Write a protein that binds this ligand. Structure first.
Ligand code: MET
Ligand SMILES: [K+]
Ligand SMILES: [K+]
Ligand SMILES: [K+]
Ligand SMILES: [K+]
Ligand SMILES: [K+]
Ligand SMILES: [K+]
Ligand SMILES: [K+]
Ligand SMILES: [K+]
Ligand SMILES: [K+]
Ligand SMILES: [K+]
Ligand SMILES: [K+]
Ligand SMILES: [Mg+2]
Ligand SMILES: [Mg+2]
Ligand SMILES: [Mg+2]
Ligand SMILES: [Mg+2]
Ligand SMILES: [Mg+2]
Ligand SMILES: [Mg+2]
Ligand SMILES: [Mg+2]
Ligand SMILES: [Mg+2]
Ligand SMILES: [Mg+2]
Ligand SMILES: [Mg+2]
Ligand SMILES: [Mg+2]
Ligand SMILES: [Mg+2]
Ligand SMILES: [Mg+2]
Ligand SMILES: [Mg+2]
Ligand SMILES: [Mg+2]
Ligand SMILES: [Mg+2]
Ligand SMILES: [Mg+2]
Ligand SMILES: [Mg+2]
Ligand SMILES: [Mg+2]
Ligand SMILES: [Mg+2]
Ligand SMILES: [Mg+2]
Ligand SMILES: [Mg+2]
Ligand SMILES: [Mg+2]
Ligand SMILES: [Mg+2]
Ligand SMILES: [Mg+2]
Ligand SMILES: [Mg+2]
Ligand SMILES: [Mg+2]
Ligand SMILES: [Mg+2]
Ligand SMILES: [Mg+2]
Ligand SMILES: [Mg+2]
Ligand SMILES: [Mg+2]
Ligand SMILES: [Mg+2]
Ligand SMILES: [Mg+2]
Ligand SMILES: [Mg+2]
Ligand SMILES: [Mg+2]
Ligand SMILES: [Mg+2]
Ligand SMILES: [Mg+2]
Ligand SMILES: [Mg+2]
Ligand SMILES: [Mg+2]
Ligand SMILES: [Mg+2]
Ligand SMILES: [Mg+2]
Ligand SMILES: [Mg+2]
Ligand SMILES: [Mg+2]
Ligand SMILES: [Mg+2]
Ligand SMILES: [Mg+2]
Ligand SMILES: [Mg+2]
Ligand SMILES: [Mg+2]
Ligand SMILES: [Mg+2]
Ligand SMILES: [Mg+2]
Ligand SMILES: [Mg+2]
Ligand SMILES: [Mg+2]
Ligand SMILES: [Mg+2]
Ligand SMILES: [Mg+2]
Ligand SMILES: [Mg+2]
Ligand SMILES: [Mg+2]
Ligand SMILES: [Mg+2]
Ligand SMILES: [Mg+2]
Ligand SMILES: [Mg+2]
Ligand SMILES: [Mg+2]
Ligand SMILES: [Mg+2]
Ligand SMILES: [Mg+2]
Ligand SMILES: [Mg+2]
Ligand SMILES: [Mg+2]
Ligand SMILES: [Mg+2]
Ligand SMILES: [Mg+2]
Ligand SMILES: [Mg+2]
Ligand SMILES: [Mg+2]
Ligand SMILES: [Mg+2]
Ligand SMILES: [Mg+2]
Ligand SMILES: [Mg+2]
Ligand SMILES: [Mg+2]
Ligand SMILES: [Mg+2]
Ligand SMILES: [Mg+2]
Lengths: 70, 381
RNA sequence: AAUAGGUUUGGUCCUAGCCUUUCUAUUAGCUCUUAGUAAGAUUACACAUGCAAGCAUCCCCGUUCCAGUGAGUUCACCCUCUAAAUC
RNA sequence: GAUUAACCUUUAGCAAUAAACGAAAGUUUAACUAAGCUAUACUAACCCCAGGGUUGGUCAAUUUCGUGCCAGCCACCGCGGUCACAC
RNA sequence: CCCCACUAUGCUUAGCCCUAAACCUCAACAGUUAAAUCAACAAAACUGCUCGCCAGAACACUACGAGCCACAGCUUAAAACUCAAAGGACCUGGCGGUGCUUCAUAUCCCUCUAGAGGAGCCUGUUCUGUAAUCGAUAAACCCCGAUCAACCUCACCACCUCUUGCUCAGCCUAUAUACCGCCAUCUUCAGCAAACCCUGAUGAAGGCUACAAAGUAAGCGCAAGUACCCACGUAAAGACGUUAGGUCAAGGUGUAGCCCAUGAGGUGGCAAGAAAUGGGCUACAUUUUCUACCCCAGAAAACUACGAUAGCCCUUAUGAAACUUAAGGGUCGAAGGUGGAUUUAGCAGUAAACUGAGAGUAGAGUGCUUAGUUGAACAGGGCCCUGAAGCGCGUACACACCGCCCGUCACCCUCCUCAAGUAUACUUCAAAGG
RNA sequence: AGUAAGGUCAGCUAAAUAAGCUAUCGGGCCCAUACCCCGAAAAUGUUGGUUAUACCCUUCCCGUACUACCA
RNA sequence: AUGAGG
């Protein structure tokens, strides 16, 4: 069989890597923004749990950790 | 013919309105006391309608003679008809020749004029990318030579500006400047896309002797004028104020900075680099001159762009105006349905090419007359 | 999806998508003679005006039904138990 | 009224049936009944009265001209470049 | 890509990363070789059972969401817009800077002989020029249509004239991309193919082994015959097709156009050279030049040599017409001193050199056709180079390698994603507590 | 406003016998183009003066360069 | 190294 199918994926992958390399810093800032919103959304979900259960504040000694970090 | 156009009721009704308007203006100027400001407007309108009314009155007199000439023939007696009818026919033919000229003269009078009658033309030809081979590029060279030869036929100065030959004895793109009298009037219709349909004989495409269709673009533009900037001091407002920055006590009391405002354009130029006001003023003038130099360049370009936007006209940039069919030896102009034989003679840019342009001018003038009558039809109703 | 059909290519075979042919329902174009029957706002947007719930020897009863809409939506069916209502 | 590609009368009667009320004769009811409007559908008929679509292949069916890869056509394949069964 | 030097890295320890054409692209277990074995190809066809996975191409090993020691990453995995195809396996042909083997005989290389490209002139062509033809215009055009243009020819140009016109009209007007006719070219080839049979499961297609295995074949071409001086050689012949090859201008004709003219007649005129080029002629000399001769000679032999067939002048021939055509004489004595890259032809009475004749014209070519004379050198190696044949291989080409096809930039259009902020709209609360 | 310095084949550099390369023209190679091969052509910004000229000086012009400071 | 269109 000819490699025509493989060649099409070869060029798509090659252009994708160059595109990623060209704008790896632009995507880095976008990824940074999404991680901050990801943590805030995660904090809101936990906050909704205790408010709906009748608790006015979070349980004593509790603090939501930054799971999305390095 | 022009006689059928006059027979149309739209033209006859409009011409009566002008004659009635022309008589109305004359009566007002003679009996009614008109204000000086309003009298001049009537005089200008009366003067403009004077050639129109005079020709129309002659046409009415010409038509009446035809009816009188026919009426006299109907009352004749057969015993003496042979000699008189021959004289009557000669008179009728002479009148018919005169009435055709009056129709032509009236038709020409209604046609307005063009701003770019004599402005020089920077003509550009580009080989359109429409098919394989060099047919498009080879055909561009023939068209470029046609315009160069046509300039010599009209005794026009042909100055070459750009010339990029192709790789197979053709032309990719070429630009040239043509100077003379009435250059733009004759060459304004030549702008557009040309189509060529031929069997290749010389070139890369000649390897396959099969008929191919190619296209190329011709760009016709008027040449602008020079850009000279003169700054009248009456239009310049000079303002002096203290400069900004850390320069000890000198700035605090001396107004070194100079602000120049051009009243017609509103541009504001400020300079405070130099300690002396005079030194800053010259530089501030220099920046203002350069900034207004661009404005005049922008002024010249914008004026040319808007010069023809007011007129209702088609975008003559991309349209198949003419077809060069070497297979059937016929150059066809789709705009006016005019076909020219002997394409080889036609490409020489001589008598044959000039006839097609003259037919374009004749047909374009006829179209202009029809549009005005339709425009006046709506106003009359 | 059937008794299937067209279409990949220089050509064949296989696979495959799309489409055609059948039967209904709205809307549009153009066109339209009669009779009978059936059915009938696009919109849970806003409504002029009239009418749609009275009865009856007074109390009661009825106006909670019929009619309408499809916004919302597994309250609709079976079983157990048992009010109201009818007898 | 607005809105939407969607567009029925600002009729008649409680005579039948159904519902409400009365012991009852009866009364009320835009429910309903009987009509009005509209090819949306079905059935039937008509002396005179037929239109709409299509005609390259799939797919039943084109003569002569005009146009000349232009104007235009097609559901799919496609047809139109001065001899078009495809406009 | 080749060569050299050197680092990450390849090694070890510890912790990561979790990808591959991780493909024997062929799931695990238990079986069968019987029927219909079976699209093709590949690695024969199937049964029972279970799990995983797949539903047109592209977008897409992508966006978003999510998980991850990963942070230019991996895993899972879309949609809108767009297309009517994509794809798998084959057949035949082409082509291959494709393999093996055998070859080319003026022939591919080495080799052999004389030339072209330099000069002058003659003659074509391209350009330029002119009011002033057309056709040919890689091999297969370029002394080509022409075995031929001062007028005529002539179809061109300017001017003038005629209109049922030399014609029961005409056109050298368009179309050689409608054709006949006559050819070029592969061909310095040997193949083309009716009618049958058979094979591939009755697919496009294929058809041979001689100690033979499915082919038989009329016809055409080759061949054989014939022409010339033999049986040799040279001519002639050379199919089907290939290049929409050349020729509407030999003639004829299809289609379309012109008919007071795109037709016809008369007068006059055009055919040149800034430049470039093809073919040919004559030379640059001593193996020569001149004369005698037709092969035992005498002179010449560098600015008075060799060398113009050119220029100028004169004469003559042809013609009605000659600065123009040709021949002859005089005068003139130029460039040229054996030619750059590159290129042509020839295997024997050939190349080379020399001398006649003919076709056509009133005349006219250094051209074409043709007869004769003198008369060679090399012919042996090689497959390195180019190409051919036989048998293979590959192929995404089929308009067939002058094929096809990839990405960036520029250009235009559609759709979508991302995105700080802001605006608008929607959803949730009481399903609670005092 | 001052001062420095540059002006050369079409282009860009080197030398002042004004050369090389590219570009340019002509030919060859190739079915064609390009590469390639052969051959040709092509210039000192300008002014004047430097025995006489050129590289110099100088006139003029284009562009370039640096400085324009402290109260 | 490149080339093909109706
Ligand atoms: C100017 O700045 C002069 N007066 C100095 C002021 S600081 C000592
Ligand atoms: K199918
Ligand atoms: K009651
Ligand atoms: K609902
Ligand atoms: K009733
Ligand atoms: K309808
Ligand atoms: K093959
Ligand atoms: K030579
Ligand atoms: K020669
Ligand atoms: K003549
Ligand atoms: K003909
Ligand atoms: K092709
Ligand atoms: Mg392979
Ligand atoms: Mg891609
Ligand atoms: Mg041809
Ligand atoms: Mg089918
Ligand atoms: Mg396919
Ligand atoms: Mg194929
Ligand atoms: Mg096909
Ligand atoms: Mg075919
Ligand atoms: Mg399907
Ligand atoms: Mg009522
Ligand atoms: Mg109800
Ligand atoms: Mg209703
Ligand atoms: Mg709804
Ligand atoms: Mg009870
Ligand atoms: Mg309706
Ligand atoms: Mg009752
Ligand atoms: Mg009704
Ligand atoms: Mg139609
Ligand atoms: Mg299609
Ligand atoms: Mg027709
Ligand atoms: Mg059809
Ligand atoms: Mg039709
Ligand atoms: Mg190392
Ligand atoms: Mg492995
Ligand atoms: Mg696998
Ligand atoms: Mg398993
Ligand atoms: Mg097993
Ligand atoms: Mg098999
Ligand atoms: Mg991957
Ligand atoms: Mg990914
Ligand atoms: Mg998602
Ligand atoms: Mg993500
Ligand atoms: Mg995995
Ligand atoms: Mg081969
Ligand atoms: Mg081969
Ligand atoms: Mg040879
Ligand atoms: Mg020569
Ligand atoms: Mg011709
Ligand atoms: Mg010629
Ligand atoms: Mg020609
Ligand atoms: Mg000749
Ligand atoms: Mg003549
Ligand atoms: Mg003629
Ligand atoms: Mg003829
Ligand atoms: Mg032909
Ligand atoms: Mg020809
Ligand atoms: Mg069989
Ligand atoms: Mg066969
Ligand atoms: Mg035989
Ligand atoms: Mg023989
Ligand atoms: Mg022969
Ligand atoms: Mg023979
Ligand atoms: Mg040829
Ligand atoms: Mg002919
Ligand atoms: Mg003819
Ligand atoms: Mg004819
Ligand atoms: Mg004529
Ligand atoms: Mg004449
Ligand atoms: Mg020749
Ligand atoms: Mg001699
Ligand atoms: Mg002489
Ligand atoms: Mg004489
Ligand atoms: Mg002579
Ligand atoms: Mg001499
Ligand atoms: Mg040599
Ligand atoms: Mg002779
Ligand atoms: Mg003779
Ligand atoms: Mg001659
Ligand atoms: Mg190639
Ligand atoms: Mg850009
Ligand atoms: Mg967003
Ligand atoms: Mg060259
Ligand atoms: Mg290129």
């Amino acid at each position: 069989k000819n490699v025509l199918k493989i060649r099409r994926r070869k060029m798509n992958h090659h252009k994708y890597r160059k595109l990623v390399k060209k704008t790896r810093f632009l995507r880095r800032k976008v990824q940074e923004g999404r991680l901050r919103r990801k943590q805030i959304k995660f904090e809101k979900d936990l906050r909704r749990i205790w408010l709906k259960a009748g608790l006015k504040e979070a349980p004593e000694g509790w603090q939501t950790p930054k799971i999305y970090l390095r | 013919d022009t006689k059928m156009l006059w027979k149309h009721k739209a033209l006859q009704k409009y011409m009566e309105n002008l004659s009635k308007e022309y008589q109305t203006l004359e009566q007002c100027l003679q009996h009614i006391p008109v204000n000086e400001e309003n009298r001049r407007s009537l005089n200008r309108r009366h003067a403009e309608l004077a050639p129109l009314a005079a020709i129309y009155q002659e046409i009415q007199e010409t038509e009446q003679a035809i009816e009188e000439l026919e009426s006299m023939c109907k009352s004749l007696n057969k015993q003496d008809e042979k000699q008189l009818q021959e004289l009557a026919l000669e008179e009728r033919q002479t009148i018919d020749q005169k009435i055709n000229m009056l129709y032509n003269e009236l038709f020409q009078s209604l046609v307005p004029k063009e701003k770019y009658d004599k402005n020089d033309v920077i003509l550009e030809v580009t080989a359109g990318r429409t098919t394989g081979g060099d047919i498009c590029q080879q055909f561009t060279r023939e068209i470029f030579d046609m315009y160069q030869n046509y300039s010599c036929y009209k005794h026009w100065q042909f100055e070459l500006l750009n010339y990029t030959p192709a790789d197979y004895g053709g032309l990719h793109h070429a630009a040239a400047r043509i100077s003379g009298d009435g250059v733009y009037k004759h060459l304004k219709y030549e702008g557009g896309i040309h189509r060529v349909q031929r069997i290749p004989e010389v070139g890369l495409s000649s390897r396959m002797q099969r008929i191919h269709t190619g296209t190329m673009s011709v760009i016709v533009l008027p040449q602008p004028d020079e850009v000279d900037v003169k700054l009248d001091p009456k239009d310049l407002r000079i303002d002096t104020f203290r400069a900004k920055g850390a320069a000890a006590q000198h700035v605090n009391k001396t107004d070194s900075a100079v602000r120049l405002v051009h009243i017609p354009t509103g541009l504001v130029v400020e300079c405070q680099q130099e300690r002396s006001q005079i030194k800053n003023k010259e530089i501030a003038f220099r920046v203002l001159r350069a900034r207004l130099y661009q404005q005049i360049i922008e002024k010249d370009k914008r004026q040319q762009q808007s010069a023809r936007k007011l007129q209702v006209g088609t975008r003559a940039q991309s349209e198949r105006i003419r077809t060069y069919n070497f297979t059937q030896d016929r150059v066809s102009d789709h705009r006016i349905a005019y076909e020219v034989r002997d394409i080889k003679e036609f490409l020489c840019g001589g008598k044959g090419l000039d006839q097609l342009i003259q037919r374009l001018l004749q047909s374009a003038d006829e179209e202009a007359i029809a549009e005005l009558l339709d425009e006046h039809l709506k106003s009359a109703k």
